[PDB]
Amino acid sequence: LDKEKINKIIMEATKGSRFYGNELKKEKQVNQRIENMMQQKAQITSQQLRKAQLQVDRFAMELEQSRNLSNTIVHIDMDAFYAAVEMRDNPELKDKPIAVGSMSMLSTSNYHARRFGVRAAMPGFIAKRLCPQLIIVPPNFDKYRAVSKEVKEILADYDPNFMAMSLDEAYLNITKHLEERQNWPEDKRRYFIKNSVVFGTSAQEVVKEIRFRIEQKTTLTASAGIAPNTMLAKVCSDKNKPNGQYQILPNRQAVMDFIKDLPIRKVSGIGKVTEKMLKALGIITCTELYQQRALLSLLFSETSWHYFLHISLGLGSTHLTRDGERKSMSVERTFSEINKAEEQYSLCQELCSELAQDLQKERLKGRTVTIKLKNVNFEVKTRASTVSSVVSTAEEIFAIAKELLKTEIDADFPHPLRLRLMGVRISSFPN
DNA sequence: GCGGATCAC
DNA sequence: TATGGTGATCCGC
Ligand SMILES: Nc1ccn([C@H]2CC[C@@H](COP(=O)(O)OP(=O)(O)OP(=O)(O)O)O2)c(=O)n1
Ligand SMILES: [Mg+2]
Ligand SMILES: [Mg+2]
Ligand SMILES: [Mg+2]
Fold this sequence. Notes:
Elements: H1 3-14, H2 18-42, H3 46-65, E1 73-78, H4 81-89, E2 98-101, E3 106-109, H5 111-114, H6 124-130, E4 135-137, H7 141-155, E5 163-164, E6 169-173, H8 175-181, E7 190-192, E8 196-198, H9 203-218, E9 222-227, H10 230-237, E10 245-247, H11 252-259, H12 272-280, H13 286-291, H14 293-299, H15 302-312, E11 328-338, H16 341-362, E12 366-375, E13 380-391, H17 394-410, E14 419-427
Parallel strand pairs: 2-4, 9-10
Antiparallel strand pairs: 1-6, 1-9, 2-3, 5-6, 7-8, 11-14, 12-13, 12-14
This protein binds 2',3'-dideoxycytidine 5'-triphosphate and magnesium ion (MG) (3 copies).
The protein binds a DNA duplex through residues 14, 17-20, 26, 29, 101-107, 120-126, 165-169, 268-274, 301, 303-304, 326-334, 336, 368, 370, 378, 380-386, 421, 423, 425, 428.
PDB class: transferase/dna
Keywords: benzo[a]pyrene-N2-Guanine, DNA replication, DNA damage tolerance, polymerase kappa, Environment pollution, TRANSFERASE-DNA complex
Assembly: trimeric
């Protein structure tokens, strides 16, 4: 299938559903938000643009002088991870389009299926219309976690403080390892094929060694990206996927050359909405992002245009922060419609118990309890309460959540809450 | 501190 | 029949 036909089949499958109504509502909000921004771009004067330009150029030179190109950052990504595990262990799924998940929701797909437009976060019953020969195999998350343990053990040899972003995705700072490796005998960097092979001393070679060891240990392929900061490493991690590598050499000109026509949507932090809004200003590549910096410093908040400027200049984090403490812990769940209040109170109490057990495993207590309600029209509400003393048990948590829920049930009385999802979150952990 | 929005994976 | 779960951040109040 092709990008034109797929959008069509999808449109046919989603049309008229409550889900799609909510999407239309959300798109209208995005549209209006854009219209407003445009009303702002209309009332901007050349004088203000000139002044803003000098402000941004000042701060820009401030960035550019501090550009750090001495670190070597790697982003490792297992290719089609979940589906690749499932393919590794069931030969019958060879050369076939598969996805991992349920008929309600798919977690991931293999490249074969991706060619039919089926992808992560897409309901199975739609992907089936995109590809009726698609094989949906159920998730085996424990397996994935285990394989993930195998590759984490390997990544720890190159940066013990590597930063895992998910089960199949991680950031490495291999600077120090490169330094030690430059005077390593051939013995420390020789490995056997599952009768031996040796890897060189360069960054590309270090990553070829990593990918090699991973493929030996798990029978699965990884792609990687190499660059002076996390932002760039993450972007060029995608460049030669699957089973590929790419490096951006640590010179300013290489960074700039790579950035030049890079769609800003590839950058981590630019989602669909920001992409649409920036597109409204004619900004699609990172150089257009640079050229519009003053206008952006007038249309957007400080944090946002500072961030955009970092993107446009090819800057990004050059050190991995050792994982700080979690700021929240939550549990939520979708179900067939629940509208009777007593049942809703039951689900709330259940979620609270589950949450309390999870808090128990990390021995945490917090001061804020938030509930999440999604009605049958996919409208999401959130209701929090912060309390003087920390709470931890299922009874305490349910004590707060119960009242929040009660308030919401009352606000619509005499109508029942028709909800398809409920959740409970706890935060405000102690300093 | 609260709630909606946005984003990553 | 049927459209997820967890965690984080930001902005405007
Ligand atoms: N909306 C999404 C998208 C992804 N994931 C999870 C499921 C698998 C993991 C990685 O999936 P992707 O990065 O979407 O794809 P992949 O299978 O890793 O394949 P590739 O990265 O090679 O495209 O992230 C998720 O929970 N929710
Ligand atoms: Mg990934
Ligand atoms: Mg991946
Ligand atoms: Mg992005």
